[PDB]
Amino acid sequence: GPETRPGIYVLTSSIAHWQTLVDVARGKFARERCSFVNRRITRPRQIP
Amino acid sequence: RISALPGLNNGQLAEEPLSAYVNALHDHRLWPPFVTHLPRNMEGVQVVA
Amino acid sequence: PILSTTTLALMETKLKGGAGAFATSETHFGNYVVGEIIPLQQSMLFNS
Amino acid sequence: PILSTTTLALMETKLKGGAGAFATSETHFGNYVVGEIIPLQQSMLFNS
Amino acid sequence: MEANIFCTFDHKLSIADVGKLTKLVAAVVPIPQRLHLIKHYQLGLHQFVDHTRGYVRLRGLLRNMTLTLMRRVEGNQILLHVPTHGLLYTVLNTGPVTWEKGDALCVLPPLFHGPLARENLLTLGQWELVLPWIVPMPLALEINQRLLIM
Amino acid sequence: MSLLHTFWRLPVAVFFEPHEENVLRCPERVLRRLLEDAAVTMRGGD
Amino acid sequence: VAVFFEPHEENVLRCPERVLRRLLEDAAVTMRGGGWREDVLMD
Amino acid sequence: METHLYSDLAFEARFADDEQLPLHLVLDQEVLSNEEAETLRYVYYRNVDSAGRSTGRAPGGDEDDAPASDDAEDAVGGDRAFDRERRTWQRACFRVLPRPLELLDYLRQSGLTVTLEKEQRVRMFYAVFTTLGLRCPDNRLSGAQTLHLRLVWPDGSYRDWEFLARDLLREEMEANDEVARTDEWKGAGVSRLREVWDVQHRVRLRVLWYVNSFWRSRELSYDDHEVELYRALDAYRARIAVEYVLIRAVRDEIYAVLRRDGGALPQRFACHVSRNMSWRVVWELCRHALALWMDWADVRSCIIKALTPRLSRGAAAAAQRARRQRERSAPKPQELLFGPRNESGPPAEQTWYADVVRCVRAQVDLGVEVRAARCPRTGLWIVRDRRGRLRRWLSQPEVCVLYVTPDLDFYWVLPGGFAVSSRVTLHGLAQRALRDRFQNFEAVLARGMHVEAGRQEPETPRVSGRRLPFD
Amino acid sequence: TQNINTVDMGLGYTSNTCVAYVNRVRTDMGVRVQDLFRVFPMNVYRHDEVDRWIRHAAGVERPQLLDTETISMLTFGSMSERNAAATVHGQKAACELILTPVTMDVNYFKIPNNPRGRASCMLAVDPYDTEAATKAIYDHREADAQT
Amino acid sequence: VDRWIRHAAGVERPQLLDTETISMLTFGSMSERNAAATVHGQKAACELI
Amino acid sequence: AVQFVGEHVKVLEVRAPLDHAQRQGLPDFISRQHVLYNGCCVVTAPKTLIEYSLPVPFHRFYSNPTICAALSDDIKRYVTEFPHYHRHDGGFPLPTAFAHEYHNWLRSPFSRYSATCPNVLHSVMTLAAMLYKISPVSLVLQTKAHI
Amino acid sequence: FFFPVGLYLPEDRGYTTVESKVKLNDTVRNALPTTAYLLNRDRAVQKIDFVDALKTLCHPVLHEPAPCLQTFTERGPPSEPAMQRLLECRFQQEPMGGAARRIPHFYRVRREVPRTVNEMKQDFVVTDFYKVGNITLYTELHPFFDFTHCQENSETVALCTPRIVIGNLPDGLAPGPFHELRTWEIMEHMRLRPPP
Amino acid sequence: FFFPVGLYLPEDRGYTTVESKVKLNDTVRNALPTTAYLLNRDRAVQKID
C-alpha cells in the first residue's frame, strides 16, 4: 500500500546460524521481497 | 443394475460420473467391439483409421 | 497365529466352549476359525 | 503305516481329537484315514 | 547448558587408538545435536561426508553444527567440552593451514592438500574421525568467493 | 553344384550346444517353406 | 551324424549367373524408378 | 505464467540487437509424455529463413556448403563445424506444470484476464510454458520462415519439430505513484489461443497471445510470396531427405560391389557351413531381405547411428591420435629399457550397430548395438550381444544383416557369414546438411550437476506431479 | 562416579534366563489399521480433485513436507499422530496390511509362518554365504524351505 | 519329445564326458546339490510303485 | 433399404489414457483397442454370400477359427497346418496389428472364462461383474458397499 | 501376530466339521467371507472390514508400480533354458489403413506364434499356481499390474501395463467360481438374489 | 513307512462311520480322491498329488 505496514513477530527456531535462518526467512517472506522491489519500481522517489 | 452401484453412484468426480469409476461398462473409454455410431463422448479418446 | 473367525457363530461357539477351545481351528464350508498356538487369550493374560 | 488322509476334513478331525486320535483309521464313503501303528507323531517325538 | 558431552565408543579401542585419541586433546570436533550423551558415529563430519553431493552441501551442514573441544579420553569415553563465548581456550590445528597472531578463524570442510595422504585418523571399522579445517578469515572468504564465482 | 568353395577339403563333426558357435544347419524342407513364405510376404509388401 | 566345414578367410560362395542377372535387374529398376521416400513425405 | 512475462521483457530489452519477436507457447500431452515433461532439461529453438539458411551462420554462405569428406581425420569439419552448428541454436526459458489442469482456469487463477473470442476449455495432463523468438530480420516478417523447437532430456537426447511462420501468423498477422509493467501485463491479459501444427503434422501445440506484448507496438509488416514458400518447401525437402539419400548410397554401394565381384562372396563371419545345402534359396532369401531392408529402413538405421559419433567434437583429434598410434615407428632398445611403456592399442572388441532383417515375418530391427571381435584361429568376426552372448542370427537361413563399423565400413551378411564389404560414402551430402541434422547435443551447466567434467552426477533433477513439491 | 568392570568366567554360557510370568499386555490387540498417509506424508494423486476425494473418503489429512536435512540434523523426530482424547485400552497395535491372493490356503495361517509367503530364517543357511541367502529368500525357481 | 518331457517335469539335460561317465557308472556321484536353506532336515525321498 | 448403403468394413484403433484415478501409476499408458465399423457380428459362415464376405478376426470373442476357415482359404490352410490353433479359448493368433494383448482392456482370463461357462443368465452377470475396475476410488465405492 | 481377511476357500473341496454346532442362514454374505472377527485386549469381539483398511488400501504407494518395474528390469531377463520360451514375444504397431483386407496375408505365412506370458499364466490350477513349476511366477509382482519381458528391436525389454478391471487377475489367484460367487454377492446386495 | 494315494474304494460296498462328524459337499472332486494329506516332522500338514 501507500503507507508501509510493519509486521512484528517473535520466532522460535532450532537454527542459530544466521545465514541459514535468513535463507529460511527469505523463503517464508518472498511476497514481501517482491513487494520491496516493486516499491522500488512504483515509487522511485522514496528509498526504503 | 448389477454393473453400477446405484446407492453410492451419487456424485461426479473429475467431470465424470461415479459409476464410470466403478465398472468399465460405464467408462466411455471402453468401446463395444462392433460400432454403428461414434459415441457422444470422446474426451480423451483418439480414433485411428 | 491369533484367534480369528469369519462369522460370529464360530466365535460364539469358541467363547462358550470349555477350556482349550481357542486352540482348535475348524471349518464350516466357506467359513473358518484359526486357533491360537499358545493360550494367550484363552487363559494366560487373564488368569493373572 | 503312517497317518495319511484323502481329505482335509478328516485331517481336521484328527487335529481336533484327543490323545490316540491318530492311531484310529476310519473312513467316509470314498475317503479314508490310515492311522499310524506307533504314536510317533502323536506323542513320541513331541513329549520331550 | 550441557557444558560437557560424553562420547561413548562401541568399538573397543586398542592401545594405538587411545594414544592417538589422547594426542588429539583440544582439537575442535563438531557434534550435530548438542546432547549430553552421544555415540561415536555422531562425532565428526563422517556422518555427512559424501563426494557425489557437493562441497556447498557439507558446508551448509557444518555451519549449523555444534563445535566442541576434545578432553581426556578414558575407557570407551572421550568427554567433549563445549566452549563458551568470551572465554579463552587452547585449540589444535590438525589442518595444514598456517596461523599468524591476531587471526580470526572460521570453520570449513577440509580441502584437498597436495600430498593426498591427509592423515586418516581413527578408522574404527569404516567410521573415521574426519575433522573440519579451522581456517583464518582471509582464506575462508577467498574460498567462499571463488566457489560463488564458479 | 558345389556352389560353395571351401578352403578345407574335409569336413568335421561339430559338437557342443548351438550357443557356443554358429553352425548353418537347415534341411531342404524348411528352406523351401521359408522361401515360399518370404515370397508371400514380398507380395504383401502414380 | 553330420559334418560341417569350419570357417576360413578363403572359402567363398558363388552366385549363379541367372541369380546375379536378377539382382542387377532389380538394382537398375530401383535406381531408375525414383521411388524415393522423401518424395512421399513431401507429397 | 511468469516465464511468458519474463521472456516478453527479455526479448524487449534485446529487440534492437536481435530483432526477435517473442512467441509464447504452451505444450501438453499432444507433444510430449509425462516422463519427458517431468525430466525435461532444456528447450532450444532455431530460426531458418525462406532459403533454408539458419540465422546463426554467415548471411551469404558458409564453408560448410562443401561436401563431406569420408575421412576420419576430417570428421566432416571437426571442431569448427561443430561450433558453427552449436552457435545456431538458442536456449529458451521454460516451466513445467506437472499436474492436470485446464488452461483457461489456470490463467484466470493467476493474475491474468482472459477474453477469448469463444470460451472453449482445453484440458491438459501437464503443461510446459516456454517462449521462443522468431526473427524478423527487419521490421518485416515472412510467412516462409520456419522455426525449429528442440526439447532435450538429461541423458542428452533431443527431439526436433519444425513449423513455418505462416502457420503461426496465419491469423495473427492476417488481421494486422507509478504503474508497473507487471500489473498492466496481468490486467491487459490474453486474447487469442491458437493451435499450430508442425510442417509434417506430427505434433500440435498452442500459441498464446497477449495484448500487452511489445509485439503490438511495433506495427512491423508481414508478407508471404508464393515463390518464397516454394523455395522454403524445397529447402525443407532437402532437410528431411538427408537420411534417405545415405540409405540409397549404401544400397547402390551394395549393388555396385555385387556387380564388381561377380556375386562371389567371401566369408567374413564365423559359421560352420555345409556344401550339401540349397544355397540358391539362400540367394533368393538374400534378394527378399535386401528389398525388405529398403522397404523398412529409417532414420534409426545403423548408418545414422554410426555417423553420429563422428560428428562429435572430439572425433577428429582422436582419429588423428589413432592414426599416429598405428603408424608409430618400432621402438628402439633404449626406449624399451629406459623409457615409458607404449600406449595400449585398440581393444580387441569394437562397438558396432546393425540392421537385422528377417524375411519370414517381415520385420526389420534398426538401432541394434553389437560387439565385434576377430577370433584368434581365423581372422573372421564374432558378433556378440552386448551382454556378452554370441549372436545366433548368422545361423538362421531367413535373416540377413547389415553392419556398419565405427570407421564407416559396412558389411552385408547372408546366412553362413558370407558378406559384401564396402564403405559408406558421404560425398552426396553437404557438410552442413549432415552436420546440422545429426550433431549430438552437448550440455551447458545447470542445476544439480558437477562443475568438474566426468563426475558421476547425483540424483537427476525432476519436477514431480505425484509428490508434494520440496522447498 | 564409580567404575565397574566385569569378567565372564565361563567357557560357555554361565547364566540363562526365562520369561516366567506375564502380567498384562501393554497394547490393545486391536484391528485398527496403520495410517499410510502418515507414514508417506508427501504423496498426492496427480489430479488434485481425485486426491481431495480420496482424502475425504478416508479420515486422512492434507500432505506434509518432510524435514530438511539441516532440520532433521537439528531435530530428532516429528510424530504426526497426536494422542487421542481417551485411551481405555492400551497402546494402539496398528495393523500393517499386505495384499494376498484370495486363493492362498488357510493351512498356512494356522501354524507360525513368515507372513510374506517364504521362509527367511538365516539359521537354515550356511553362515556368511550371501548368494545362498539371496537364493533362499528371493529365488522363486527353487522350493521354499518351510513348505 | 525328450526335451518337451524334461521341460514339463522340470528336469535338465544330461551333461556328460567319457571319464565322468566312467566314474558315474562305476561308483556314482552326489549329483544332486543341497538346497539353499534346510529347515526340515534331510529330504526323505518317497519312491513310488 | 439400399438407399442408405454406407461403406465397406473398417477396423479402427481406439487410444485412451485411463481415468484420473487409474492414470496415477504409469501415467503414460495409452490403452489401445480395436473395433469393427461397417461390419457384422456373425455366428455362421454365410454360404450364399461367400464370394462377397471376408472374415475379420479382431477380438478374443470374435475370432472363431471355424467361421474364418470356412470364409477364407489362407486361414483354412493355416488351421490345417496347426490343428491346435482350431480352438476357441482365445488362443487363435490374431493378426499382428490386432495382437496387442497387454494394452487391451479384456485379456486372457475373460476368454478362458467364457470358453467353458454355461450359457445362462448368471454367466452374463458375472462377465459384467468381472469388469469392476481396479481404481482406488472404485475400492472406496465397492468397500463402502461391503462387496 | 498375523491373520487373514477375506480368503475364499475352494468350493470343489469344501467341507464342514461343525455341522452339529452351528447353522448359518443361506445367504451370500454368509457364503463369502469378507469380515474377520477377533478378541480384544479384554475378550470383547472386534471386527475388521475392508472399510477400515482404506487408510492403507487407498494410499498412492499401493497403486504405483515404478519401483516394481525398476526391480524387475534390474534383475534382468531369466537365463534358465526353460524361461527362454517365456521371453519370446513380439508386439508391433501396424497401421490400420488396409488392415481388414490383409488379414489373409498374415495367415498365408504358415508359421506359428508364441503364447504371451499372460496366456500361459492361465493354464495353472489354483493349487499348482504356487508351485515351483509355475515358471511365470517371476512376473506376478503386483495385484493391479501386468509384467512381462518381450522382444523389442532384437533385445529383451521389460513391459508393465495395468490391469484395468478386476477380471484381468489370473485364474490361479481369482478363479472363475470366485468371480461367480462374488457376482451372487453383488446381486444379493441389489435385492436380485432370485433374479427375474 | 508306506502309504497309498489315489485308491478307489468299492462303491458297491461303500459306508461311513463319521457321518455325524464330517460333511463333504456333493462334488466328484470330493468323491474321487487324487490327493493324500500327511504331517511334517512338525505337526504341520503337507500334501502330495
The DSSP line for L49-101 is -SSTTHHHHTSTTTT--HHHHHHHHHT-S--STTTHHHH--B-----STTGGG
Residues in chain H with CB shorter than 8 Å from the CB of G31 are 252, 255
Cα H338 to its chain centre, rounded Å, is 49
User: For residues H345 and H233, is the Cβ–Cβ distance under 8 A?
Assistant: no
CA proximity to K139, closest of L178, L53, I97, B17: L53
Alpha-carbon gap, residue L33 to D24, rounded angstroms: 33
Phi, psi of H355 (to 5 degrees): -120, 115
Q: What are the DSSP calls for G11-32, one per residue?
A: -EE---HHHHHHHHHHHHHHHH
Breaks, C-N > 2.5 A, in chain F lie after 45
Alpha-carbon gap, residue M16 to H457, rounded angstroms: 76
List all residues of chain H from 438 to 467 with a beta carbon under 8 Å from chain L. 466
Orientation of helix H431-438 relative to helix H78-86, angle to 10°: 60
C-alpha cell at F27: 534341411
Resolution of this structure in Å: 3.3
CA proximity to H125, closest of K27, K32, K137, I54: K27
Alpha-carbon gap, residue H368 to H401, rounded angstroms: 11
User: For residues M14 and M20, is the Cβ–Cβ distance under 8 A?
Assistant: no
CA proximity to H143, closest of H20, H227, H234, H211: H227
User: For residues J37 and I145, is the Cβ–Cβ distance under 8 A?
Assistant: yes
Half-sphere exposure of residue H372, counting CA atoms within 13 Å on the CB side? Answer: 20
CA proximity to H421, closest of H435, H430, H439, H408: H408
β-pairing verdict for H381-385 and H389-390 = antiparallel
Cα I42 to its chain centre, rounded Å, is 20
Half-sphere exposure of residue M36, counting CA atoms within 13 Å on the CB side? Answer: 16
Nearest Cα residue in chain L from H385: L155
Residues in chain D with CB shorter than 8 Å from the CB of L17 are 9, 12-13, 16
Establish, for the pair of chains G and H, how many residue pairs have beta carbons separated by less than 8 Å: 96
Q: How far is E53 from chain I (nearest CA, A)?
A: 13
Task: Judge K/J contact: 3 or more CB pairs < 8 A.
Answer: no
F34 burial class (0-12, 13-18, 19+ CB within 10 angstroms)?
buried
Alpha-carbon gap, residue H311 to E20, rounded angstroms: 57
What technique determined this structure? cryo-EM
CB contact under 8 Å between H468 and I43, yes or no, is yes
CB contact under 8 Å between I3 and E75, yes or no, is yes
Helix (H, G, I), strand (E, B) or coil at H126: coil
* Cβ count near M6 (within 10 Å): 12
Helix (H, G, I), strand (E, B) or coil at E30: strand
Q: With an 8 Å Cβ cutoff, is F32 touching chain L?
A: no
Residue H263 CA: distances (Å) to CA of F39, G6, G7, H259, K59? 22, 22, 19, 7, 48
CA proximity to L80, closest of J15, I131, J11, H395: J11
Helix (H, G, I), strand (E, B) or coil at M19: coil
User: For residues E150 and E46, is the Cβ–Cβ distance under 8 A?
Assistant: no
Alpha-carbon gap, residue K96 to L109, rounded angstroms: 12
Residue L41 CA: distances (Å) to CA of I28, I88, I89, I92? 5, 10, 7, 11
β-pairing verdict for H381-385 and H90-92 = unpaired
Alpha-carbon gap, residue H30 to H128, rounded angstroms: 11
Alpha-carbon gap, residue L151 to L160, rounded angstroms: 14
User: For residues I74 and A14, is the Cβ–Cβ distance under 8 A?
Assistant: yes
Amino acid identity, position H182:
T
Phi, psi of F15 (to 5 degrees): -105, -170
* Cβ count near L82 (within 10 Å): 16
Phi, psi of B12 (to 5 degrees): -125, 145
Alpha-carbon gap, residue C30 to L178, rounded angstroms: 11
User: For residues C2 and C36, is the Cβ–Cβ distance under 8 A?
Assistant: yes
Q: With an 8 Å Cβ cutoff, is A15 touching chain I?
A: yes
User: For residues H135 and H55, is the Cβ–Cβ distance under 8 A?
Assistant: yes
Alpha-carbon gap, residue H155 to H149, rounded angstroms: 18
Q: With an 8 Å Cβ cutoff, is H458 touching chain I?
A: no
Helix (H, G, I), strand (E, B) or coil at L118: helix
Alpha-carbon gap, residue I52 to I61, rounded angstroms: 9
Alpha-carbon gap, residue E81 to E68, rounded angstroms: 5
Helix (H, G, I), strand (E, B) or coil at H135: strand
Q: How far is I85 from chain B (nearest CA, A)?
A: 32
Alpha-carbon gap, residue K56 to K54, rounded angstroms: 7
Alpha-carbon gap, residue H93 to F4, rounded angstroms: 64
Residues in chain H with CB shorter than 8 Å from the CB of K17 are 29, 125
- Counting every residue, how long is chain A? 48
What letter does residue A36 receive in the DSSP assignment? H
CA proximity to J39, closest of I115, I142, I119, I138: I119
CB contact under 8 Å between M4 and D27, yes or no, is no
Instruction: Report the residue from F12, F14, F38 with minimal CB separation from H359.
Output: F38
